[PDB]
């Protein structure tokens, strides 16, 4: 799939969100929304702000 790099820590603030640490390599599940992307962080899935991750090309 697609991988993204976490640019900052992000602590989930809502049920559909997930937490990540700066430096994390996340599997990107859905990037159809411009503000919130669905990612896999270890054994969890949910939304983090699109601005806080960077697609790995």
Curated annotation (Swiss-Prot):
Signal peptide: none annotated. Residues 1-57 form the SH3 domain. It is found in: Cytoplasm, Cytoskeleton; Cytoplasm, Cell cortex. Coiled coil: none annotated. Belongs to the spectrin family. Morphologically, spectrin-like proteins appear to be related to spectrin, showing a flexible rod-like structure. They can bind actin but seem to differ in their calmodulin-binding activity. In nonerythroid tissues, spectrins, in association with some other proteins, may play an important role in membrane organization. Like erythrocyte spectrin, the spectrin-like proteins are capable of forming dimers which can further associate to tetramers. Interacts with ACP1. This is Spectrin alpha chain, non-erythrocytic 1. The lineage of its organism: Eukaryota, Metazoa, Chordata, Craniata, Vertebrata.
């Amino acid at each position: 799939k697609e991988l993204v790099l976490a640019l900052y820590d992000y602590q989930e603030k809502s049920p559909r969100e997930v937490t990540m640490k700066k430096g994390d390599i996340l599997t990107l599940l859905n990037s159809t929304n411009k503000d919130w992307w669905k990612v896999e962080v270890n054994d969890r899935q949910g939304f983090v702000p699109a601005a806080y991750v960077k697609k790995l090309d």
